[PDB]
Amino acid sequence: HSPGLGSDMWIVGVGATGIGSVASAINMLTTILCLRAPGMTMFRMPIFTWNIFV
Amino acid sequence: MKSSAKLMYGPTVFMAAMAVIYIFATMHVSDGGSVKGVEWVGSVALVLSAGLTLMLGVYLHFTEVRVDVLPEDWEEAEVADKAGTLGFFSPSSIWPAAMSGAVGFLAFGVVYFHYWMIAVGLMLLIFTITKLNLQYGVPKEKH
Amino acid sequence: FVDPAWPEHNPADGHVVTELISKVAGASSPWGDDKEFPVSAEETGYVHPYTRIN
Amino acid sequence: QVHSGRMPILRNEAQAERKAPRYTEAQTLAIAAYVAANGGGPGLVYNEDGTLAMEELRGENYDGQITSADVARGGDLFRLNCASCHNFTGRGGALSSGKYAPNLDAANEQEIYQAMLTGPQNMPKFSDRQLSADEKKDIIAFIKSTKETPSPGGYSLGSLGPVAEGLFMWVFGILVLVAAAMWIGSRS
Amino acid sequence: SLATVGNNLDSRYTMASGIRRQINKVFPTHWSFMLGEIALYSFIVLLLTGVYLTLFFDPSITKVIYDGGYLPLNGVEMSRAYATALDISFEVRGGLFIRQMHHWAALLFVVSMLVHMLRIFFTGAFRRPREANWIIGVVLIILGMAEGFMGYSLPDDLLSGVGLRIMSAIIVGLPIIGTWMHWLIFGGDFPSDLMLDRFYIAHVLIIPAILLGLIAAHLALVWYQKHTQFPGAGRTENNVIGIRIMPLFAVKAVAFGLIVFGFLALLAGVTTINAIWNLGPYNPSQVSAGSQPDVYMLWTDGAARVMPAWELYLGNYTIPAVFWVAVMLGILVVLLVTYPFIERKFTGDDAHHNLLQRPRDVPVRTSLGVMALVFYILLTVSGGNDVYAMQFHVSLNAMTWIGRIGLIVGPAIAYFITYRLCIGLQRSDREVLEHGIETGIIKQMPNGAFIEVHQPLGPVDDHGHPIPLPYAGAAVPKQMNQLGYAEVETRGGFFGPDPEDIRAKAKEIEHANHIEEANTLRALNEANIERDKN
Amino acid sequence: AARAVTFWLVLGIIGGLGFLATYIFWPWEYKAHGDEGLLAYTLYTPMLGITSGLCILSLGFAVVLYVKKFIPEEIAVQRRHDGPSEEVDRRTIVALLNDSWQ
Amino acid sequence: AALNRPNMVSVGTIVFLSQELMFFAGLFAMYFVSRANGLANGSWGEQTDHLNVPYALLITVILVSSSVTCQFGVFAAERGDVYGLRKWFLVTIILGSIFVIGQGYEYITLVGHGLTIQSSVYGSAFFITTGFHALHVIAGVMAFVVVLMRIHKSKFTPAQATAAMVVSYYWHFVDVVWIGLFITIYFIQ
Amino acid sequence: PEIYRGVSTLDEPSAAWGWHGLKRNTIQLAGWISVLFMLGYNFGNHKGHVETIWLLVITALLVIGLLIHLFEPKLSQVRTITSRNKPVGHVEPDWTYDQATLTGTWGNLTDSQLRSVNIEPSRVA
Numbered sequence A: 001h002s003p004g005l006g007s008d009m010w011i012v013g014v015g016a017t018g019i020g021s022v023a024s025a026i027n028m029l030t031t032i033l034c035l036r037a038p039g040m041t042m043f044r045m046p047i048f049t050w051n052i053f054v
Numbered sequence B: 001m002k003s004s005a006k007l008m009y010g011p012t013v014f015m016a017a018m019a020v021i022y023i024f025a026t027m028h029v030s031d032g033g034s035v036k037g038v039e040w041v042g043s044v045a046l047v048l049s050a051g052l053t054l055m056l057g058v059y060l061h062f063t064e065v066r067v068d069v070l071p072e073d074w075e076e077a078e079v080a081d082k083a084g085t086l087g088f089f090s091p092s093s094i095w096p097a098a099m100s101g102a103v104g105f106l107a108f109g110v111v112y113f114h115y116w117m118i119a120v121g122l123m124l125l126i127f128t129i130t131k132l133n134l135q136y137g138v139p140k141e142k143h
Numbered sequence C: 001f002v003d004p005a006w007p008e009h010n011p012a013d014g015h016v017v018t019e020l021i022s023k024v025a026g027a028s029s030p031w032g033d034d035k036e037f038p039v040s041a042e043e044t045g046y047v048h049p050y051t052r053i054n
Numbered sequence D: 001q002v003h004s005g006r007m008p009i010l011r012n013e014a015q016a017e018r019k020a021p022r023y024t025e026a027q028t029l030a031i032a033a034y035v036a037a038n039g040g041g042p043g044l045v046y047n048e049d050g051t052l053a054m055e056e057l058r059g060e061n062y063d064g065q066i067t068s069a070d071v072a073r074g075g076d077l078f079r080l081n082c083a084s085c086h087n088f089t090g091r092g093g094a095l096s097s098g099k100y101a102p103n104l105d106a107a108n109e110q111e112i113y114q115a116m117l118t119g120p121q122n123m124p125k126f127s128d129r130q131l132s133a134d135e136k137k138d139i140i141a142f143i144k145s146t147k148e149t150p151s152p153g154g155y156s157l158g159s160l161g162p163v164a165e166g167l168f169m170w171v172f173g174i175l176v177l178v179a180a181a182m183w184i185g186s187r188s
Numbered sequence E: 001s002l003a004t005v006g007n008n009l010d011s012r013y014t015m016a017s018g019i020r021r022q023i024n025k026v027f028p029t030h031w032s033f034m035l036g037e038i039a040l041y042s043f044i045v046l047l048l049t050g051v052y053l054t055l056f057f058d059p060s061i062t063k064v065i066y067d068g069g070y071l072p073l074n075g076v077e078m079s080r081a082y083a084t085a086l087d088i089s090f091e092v093r094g095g096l097f098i099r100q101m102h103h104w105a106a107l108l109f110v111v112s113m114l115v116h117m118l119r120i121f122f123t124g125a126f127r128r129p130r131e132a133n134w135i136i137g138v139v140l141i142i143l144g145m146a147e148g149f150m151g152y153s154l155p156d157d158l159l160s161g162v163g164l165r166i167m168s169a170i171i172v173g174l175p176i177i178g179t180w181m182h183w184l185i186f187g188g189d190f191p192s193d194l195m196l197d198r199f200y201i202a203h204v205l206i207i208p209a210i211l212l213g214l215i216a217a218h219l220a221l222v223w224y225q226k227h228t229q230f231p232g233a234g235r236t237e238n239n240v241i242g243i244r245i246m247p248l249f250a251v252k253a254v255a256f257g258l259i260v261f262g263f264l265a266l267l268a269g270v271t272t273i274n275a276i277w278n279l280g281p282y283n284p285s286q287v288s289a290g291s292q293p294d295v296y297m298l299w300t301d302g303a304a305r306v307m308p309a310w311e312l313y314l315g316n317y318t319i320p321a322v323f324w325v326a327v328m329l330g331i332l333v334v335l336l337v338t339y340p341f342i343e344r345k346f347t348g349d350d351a352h353h354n355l356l357q358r359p360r361d362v363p364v365r366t367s368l369g370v371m372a373l374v375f376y377i378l379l380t381v382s383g384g385n386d387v388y389a390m391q392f393h394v395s396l397n398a399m400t401w402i403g404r405i406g407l408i409v410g411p412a413i414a415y416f417i418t419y420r421l422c423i424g425l426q427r428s429d430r431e432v433l434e435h436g437i438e439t440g441i442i443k444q445m446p447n448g449a450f451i452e453v454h455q456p457l458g459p460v461d462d463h464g465h466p467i468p469l470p471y472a473g474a475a476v477p478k479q480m481n482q483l484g485y486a487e488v489e490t491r492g493g494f495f496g497p498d499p500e501d502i503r504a505k506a507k508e509i510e511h512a513n514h515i516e517e518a519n520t521l522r523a524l525n526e527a528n529i530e531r532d533k534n
Numbered sequence F: 001a002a003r004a005v006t007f008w009l010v011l012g013i014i015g016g017l018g019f020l021a022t023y024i025f026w027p028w029e030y031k032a033h034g035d036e037g038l039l040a041y042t043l044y045t046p047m048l049g050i051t052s053g054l055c056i057l058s059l060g061f062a063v064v065l066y067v068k069k070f071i072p073e074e075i076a077v078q079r080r081h082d083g084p085s086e087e088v089d090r091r092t093i094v095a096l097l098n099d100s101w102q
Numbered sequence G: 001a002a003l004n005r006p007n008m009v010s011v012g013t014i015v016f017l018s019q020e021l022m023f024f025a026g027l028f029a030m031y032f033v034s035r036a037n038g039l040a041n042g043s044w045g046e047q048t049d050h051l052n053v054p055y056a057l058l059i060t061v062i063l064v065s066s067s068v069t070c071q072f073g074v075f076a077a078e079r080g081d082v083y084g085l086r087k088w089f090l091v092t093i094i095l096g097s098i099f100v101i102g103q104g105y106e107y108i109t110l111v112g113h114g115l116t117i118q119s120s121v122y123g124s125a126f127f128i129t130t131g132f133h134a135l136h137v138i139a140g141v142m143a144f145v146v147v148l149m150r151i152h153k154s155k156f157t158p159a160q161a162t163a164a165m166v167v168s169y170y171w172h173f174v175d176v177v178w179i180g181l182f183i184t185i186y187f188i189q
Numbered sequence H: 001p002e003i004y005r006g007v008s009t010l011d012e013p014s015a016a017w018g019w020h021g022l023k024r025n026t027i028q029l030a031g032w033i034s035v036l037f038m039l040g041y042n043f044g045n046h047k048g049h050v051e052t053i054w055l056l057v058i059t060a061l062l063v064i065g066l067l068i069h070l071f072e073p074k075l076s077q078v079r080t081i082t083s084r085n086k087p088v089g090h091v092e093p094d095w096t097y098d099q100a101t102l103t104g105t106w107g108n109l110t111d112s113q114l115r116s117v118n119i120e121p122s123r124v125a
């Protein structure tokens, strides 16, 4: 129903841009866990970092 | 990190509860605007989403029980407590960019469905991943 | 057998690396975590090449 | 058009594509029967029985295998009319503006016959008066022999020719020898 | 009884003194200094496989009925050239293997010369006193291309025949001497009886003689002016640091020679090239899609596609649209041959250069090179844009316009990017000399500052910041593993270690050896400083 | 290191014997589309390539692996004698040519 | 002296393995929906007759035992033993490549009956799941070989030890996915 | 310092190593020759104008670029003050140093403030 070659490029491009999101989530999740300043507990970090955590 | 492990139980229990309600409400409710029967897609996905949260939660829980009271987890810590060394962070590398270029080659390989392009892209990706890992290991030139 | 490059640690109430815990906040140094940097320019064995053109 | 999965058209562009067939064999023949009732033209080629000829249209003198004397003649016919739009061995070729002559690997022999009997889009029509039955069968013999015969020597690089042999060497061949040179020599 | 063989050889030719100097010549060891050898070895394979190939080949145009080994072509009227080329590959045991070896060797030959020319260009090895080598080499590449062209046009198949048709019709269209030249080359209208005989003799004798002569002159002239080298440690413009001819250079040359020979011998079997049986005999009326020449000839064919219809119709005369193509191809060659001279004109550098220079330190030339590479690649791609269009689903008209416009915009972007990247590479070099190697060990000071540990490659003062070293023309290390700080300190196999005594004893000797090696380079520099003082 | 070199040497010998055996005994004559033993034929040239490649390539690897494991480590420095020649000879070659012309 | 902070690389890899579970959630969803549709007609049972359950057992144990050996290889990395790591990793490479060859042979022995990708919905679903898993296993084997190259080139420091511990995590995950996938396909049919 | 062939080492660090930067006149000459070629592509056999609109757009971009390259335009410094920004010639006090060692910004804190920062009022002077 969609014989065009553009649709395959769409699929593959979507897939690739989705790898970058997991690649970014991996180190945006473990930076919070591991690398924090002395005194910066989980409940001291700003709302922005909580949102990126979730 | 102690409180990071605990907060995952929230979503875990939530997803686990929904994955039960979904299954039982799809197979035993006739609405008239749908057909009776287990969904089989929203059930697997919700069960395994609970699984993901549980996995991460449990791993962080086991990890946090062997860890000392870290200055970042201490309320009244001084800046001079973490006075030692942090880890080793990569200063620079070209291999991320090339590695992305390699994934972009087998991408087009699969798009056009060219066997040679897929094969080359696969070997190109292996090569770049290998170089990325063996970046800081390349021995001094044995002349 | 214990590797020469393995950090000299007491094998009692202490272990340098396991499955899930470590001694640093981040990746362990690939040139030995017990290696003190920087060192004198002599130890590097780098020979600055005096060159003159023309 | 229907069996080869070319119809129905999903979007207007430079050229309609072969894709997955929408209808089966029987359904195709039913649609064909209905269409031919509105004034008929070229019909399907049959054999001794009322069955669609497939492996029987692989040469004039075909019995159980392709005669080497059929591929010789079919080759020259193929080269004269269709080697231009297609490749030498029907690998495909480009046309004016987004159009192309497709690779011939995917078509069965009935589809070949009906392709040159009708003229799909930009393909000219080759009536039975122009290219006789025997000539058409010889063309099919050559097509199906060049497809199904492995290269005598090597891995035929898609049979494209000087452009594919030059990419294997100039980009991949030299790289291996550079890697060998980088291994023997020094980096300083 | 070998000393008596030496005694006889010396008593006659007084050869002891003149060969001591031959076996003691030192050659710089660099992976890029082996690229010319690939061309040499490929050329040797071509001569050997070519001679074998002429024992079965009849270069005649006389039509015959084929009744040979290839049954799918039995009964067709073909030339003697095509029939015998079909007999090499279908009636001679291992004839197809040798034919494919020959063609693969041709491809490798041309690409080896191209890559070698690129090495010469980028590193600046064409400068005084090595311009003669540049001109000789440029003539070598053009003749190599011409040789390959007349080689693939020998079988007289349909694909190669169209190449000859194109070539003949290019010549015939020349402004004044265009139709008179065509009759002098082909011996009449195309095709002609003597054409494949003039092509055969030019291919087996005329060009290879000239080529061998030029190559021999090339090698002798290189051997006479020792070699260039990169400005490393202890290396000046009045010395060569490397390895002597024997026992180390001679053996390495043979090993790499065998490597190339073995690789060509693998390709000759495992991949198909020029499957002439698929194509039929040459016929002026039939043609195929694409029908491109060999990869080295694609740039010329790509030039003809992207040139618009610009015919000049004078009074009762015609300049064909192809003529401008010749003009363009005439410019590209002249620009390439007389490069050292235009280099010198615009730079005003007329010194004796024995030390190479890294591409990153000559951004204008590097950028011009990448600009020219993009030009050549666009010509090559657009010469074969029919196969690109079909396989990659792009408009053929769009491909033509990409070629046309890309030849203006492609080179410009290539220059800009390459220049900026060269300066970037220069900057990264200076950072290391000024501040030291970035360890990557980020540590937190008591105050809370994150600082990265820097490893200085020179002496420091007494306030942290070490006195930066000036650029010395050589590669400066940027990783800490490049100083051997990640070196494996276990000796042994894969499953078992070595005894301790044999292990610690071995680390001591390797440590002493590497220290003394660095000391040689240090001492070299010191002597060189005092030498350059005078 | 001796076992590393000997591996490539033995492998090269096997490759050489393979090439000789395949060149002589392997079915090499042309077989058409339908003919039985088409597979045995279309694999003749590939087999020649595989075996000859193995023989020569392995010998090459063995030779290179010897120089970087057994031949000692050498840095040699040679003095360059190039550029313009000595003036003594310079004015001696132009005076001789001038004498021959005059 | 030094505190006992979490392993940063281990935490990173566990977070990566979590996302790799959801990739198989999609495949399992596709399989179960197709299975429901197949059982509605009663045509599922006919397609399942192409399964070699005994052959899929000994392959499974070949994978499972591989995980065992892998763990031994990691037990040697916690202490400084470079040779203990080197031995067990080689055994696991061999034992994993045997799985891949085994699975490949099953594929070649499954086209002989009529279990093809485009032969049925069952065939499509069978090959998608086990095919992706096969790709993951190949990637795991290549991870092992690259870590074996790292152990050969660098000096065996806790940094290199960590690199081996995480690849073991990947291997365990892939084996666990196989265990869950074999029960679904072969036991439950 | 150390200017070679008109190009400064400050911008191009390897100034005395090779060819380093051309003249503004050769870049302009090449650009205008290219513009001539791009305009000259409009004469030949083609009926379509989807390639004409492609030529004219690129030519326009090239002409705009060459004009920017010729009449080198510069802008002024925005000499403004937004919110709590200080005018140029202000020194920023080391806040963290003033926090650690009571001195400056954290100089005049009373006992009440001292107790608020969990600092017993006894460690005076």
Ligand SMILES: CC(C)=CCC/C(C)=C/CC/C(C)=C/CC/C(C)=C\CC/C(C)=C/CC/C(C)=C/CC/C(C)=C/CC/C(C)=C/CC/C(C)=C/CC1=C(C)C(=O)c2ccccc2C1=O
Binding pocket: E209, E210, E213, E214, E216, E217, E220
């Ligand atoms: C020490 C050493 C081995 C150094 C390396 C020198 C070396 C190999 C240099 C490369 C050779 C050169 C210079 C090649 C030129 C390259 C080039 C421009 C073109 C390619 C040449 C080419 C197309 C060849 C193919 C056909 C062709 C035209 C061949 C030449 C035909 C001729 C004239 C052959 C005879 C000349 C010849 C081989 C001489 C050997 C040299 C010697 C020692 C000659 C001594 C000599 C004798 C003995 C006489 O009797 C004599 C009588 C009358 C006049 C002169 C001489 C004379 O010079």
Ligand SMILES: CC(C)=CCC/C(C)=C/CC/C(C)=C/CC/C(C)=C\CC/C(C)=C\CC/C(C)=C/CC/C(C)=C/CC/C(C)=C/CC/C(C)=C/CC1=C(C)C(=O)c2ccccc2C1=O
Binding pocket: E037, E041, E044, E047, E048, E212, E215, E216, E219, E220, E222, E223, E253, E254, E257, E258
């Ligand atoms: C080196 C190698 C390929 C080893 C593999 C073993 C091998 C030779 C296998 C093949 C066995 C063969 C050839 C069997 C057939 C024997 C037979 C009947 C005939 C052989 C004759 C033949 C093939 C061709 C005709 C004549 C011939 C050898 C022509 C090509 C050689 C030429 C043009 C040499 C130039 C002459 C000359 C004055 C050279 C100057 C001095 C030398 C030694 C130059 C060559 C040279 C070499 C060899 C370098 O490696 C090199 C590396 C780095 C920088 C420079 C050079 C360099 O200049």
Ligand SMILES: CCCCCCCCCCCCCCCC(=O)O[C@H](COC(=O)CCCCCCC[C@@H](C)CCCCCCCCC)COP(=O)(O)O[C@H]1[C@H](O)[C@H](O)[C@@H](O)[C@@H](O)[C@@H]1O
Binding pocket: E091, E092, E093, F024
């Ligand atoms: C001058 C060449 C130098 C050769 C270099 C040495 C290499 C050694 C290995 C040689 C490979 C052996 C190939 C033998 C080939 C074979 O098997 O021959 C057949 C029947 O042989 C037999 O039983 C007996 C064969 C005895 C001959 C073997 C000679 C090798 C030794 C003894 C000579 C020493 C060499 C000295 C070295 C000197 C070096 C000089 C450079 C004829 O049957 P036929 O029906 O005519 O079929 C034809 C195809 O065979 C044929 O190839 C052809 O291509 C087809 O067209 C077809 O006609």
Ligand SMILES: CCCCCCCCCCCCCCCC(=O)O[C@H](COC(=O)CCCCCCC[C@@H](C)CCCCCCCCC)COP(=O)(O)O[C@H]1[C@H](O)[C@H](O)[C@@H](O)[C@@H](O)[C@@H]1O
Binding pocket: D014, D096, D097, D098, E395, E396, E397, E398, E399, E401, E402, E405, E406, E409, E410, E413, H048, H050, H051, H052, H054
């Ligand atoms: C190494 C990286 C390589 C990256 C290169 C990527 C750049 C490629 C751009 C591709 C643009 C193609 C757009 C297609 C446009 C198209 O198809 O139009 C054709 C005419 O093509 C044109 O003029 C377009 C040519 C202009 C292209 C300019 C390319 C210059 C590049 C080199 C520079 C830009 C990118 C730089 C990237 C560098 C990277 C560093 C930053 C004529 O149409 P036509 O075949 O006649 O068909 C229709 C009937 O069917 C139908 O009836 C209809 O009615 C008819 O009207 C007719 O249209």
Ligand code: HEC
Binding pocket: D004, D006, D016, D018, D077, D078, D081, D082, D084, D085, D086, D095, D099, D100, D101, D102, D103, D104, D105, D106, D107, D111, D112, D113, D115, D116, D120, D121, D122, D123, D124, D139
């Ligand atoms: C443009 C000139 C042109 C010539 C001459 C030509 N073809 Fe084609 N051919 C085409 C084009 C364009 C198509 C695609 C039309 C379509 O699929 O709608 C095509 C389609 C076909 C198809 C359907 C292809 C497929 O993959 O199913 C076959 C079979 C075919 N051609 C065979 C032939 C044979 C056999 C001859 C001559 C003896 C021939 N063609 C001559 C252009 C040509």
Ligand code: HEM
Binding pocket: E032, E033, E034, E035, E036, E037, E039, E040, E113, E114, E116, E117, E120, E125, E126, E130, E133, E134, E135, E136, E137, E138, E140, E141, E215, E218, E219, E222, E226, E227, E228, E229
């Ligand atoms: C027929 C192909 C060629 C062969 C067989 C060949 C062979 C060689 C060899 C063996 C060397 C010495 C080793 C080396 O530096 O790599 C060399 C050097 C050189 N070649 Fe070539 N060459 C060829 C083509 C060319 C071309 C096309 C050019 C130039 C356009 C060229 C210019 C040079 C220069 C300048 C050197 C000197 C390198 C140096 O001394 O620093 N050569 N060539």
Ligand code: HEM
Binding pocket: E043, E046, E047, E050, E051, E053, E054, E057, E085, E088, E099, E100, E102, E103, E105, E106, E109, E144, E147, E148, E149, E151, E152, E153, E154, E155, E203, E204, E205, E208, E211, E273, E274
């Ligand atoms: C610069 C070196 C050479 C190059 C680049 C070269 C290139 C080529 C090429 C590309 C072909 C086409 C091969 C094919 O049809 O598959 C060919 C064929 C041929 N070459 Fe060469 N060649 C070279 C040297 C020689 C020499 C020295 C000879 C003879 C003494 C020779 C004899 C032949 C013959 C007879 C053919 C025709 C046989 C055939 O077409 O299969 N070649 N050459």
Ligand SMILES: CCCCCCCCCCCCCC(=O)O[C@H](COC(=O)CCCCCCCCCCC)COP(=O)(O)O
Binding pocket: B113, B114, B115, B116, B117, B120, D157, D158, D159, D160, D163, D164, D166, D167, D168, D170, D171, D172, E295, E298, E380, E381, E383, E384, E385, E387, E388, E391
């Ligand atoms: C350096 C410049 C080269 C000049 C080329 C001009 C540009 C046009 C190129 C057209 C490309 C056509 C591609 C194509 O149609 O694909 C195929 C046809 O040609 C080829 O097979 C390309 C072979 C190229 C060499 C790759 C070898 C990989 C093995 C590497 C191991 C070391 C068709 O797809 P397929 O083969 O069925 O997978």
Ligand SMILES: CCCCCCCCCCCCCC(=O)O[C@H](COC(=O)CCCCCCCCCCC)COP(=O)(O)O
Binding pocket: B110, B118, G107, G111, G115, G116, G117, G127, G128, G131, G132
């Ligand atoms: C995104 C990563 C890309 C990975 C590249 C791997 C590409 C594998 C292509 C396999 C094609 C074989 C199909 C075929 O025609 O043979 C068919 C049989 O195939 C099988 O049963 C085994 C296929 C193995 C499953 C691999 C699934 C991998 C999923 C990748 C998602 C793109 C036979 O077709 P036929 O009858 O000849 O028409």
Ligand SMILES: CCCCCCCCCCCCCC(=O)O[C@H](COC(=O)CCCCCCCCCCC)COP(=O)(O)O
Binding pocket: E117, E118, E121, E335, E336, E339, E342, E343, E346, E368, E369, E372, E407, E408, H021, H022, H023, H025, H026, H029, H030, H031, H033, H034, H037
């Ligand atoms: C068909 C599309 C045509 C494209 C039109 C573009 C042409 C623009 C012409 C501009 C002329 C500039 C003249 C000038 O100012 O002189 C100089 C241009 O630079 C050159 O010397 C040109 C060298 C080109 C040789 C390239 C071949 C070498 C690479 C081969 C590597 C394998 C400028 O020098 P200057 O800045 O004044 O110091």
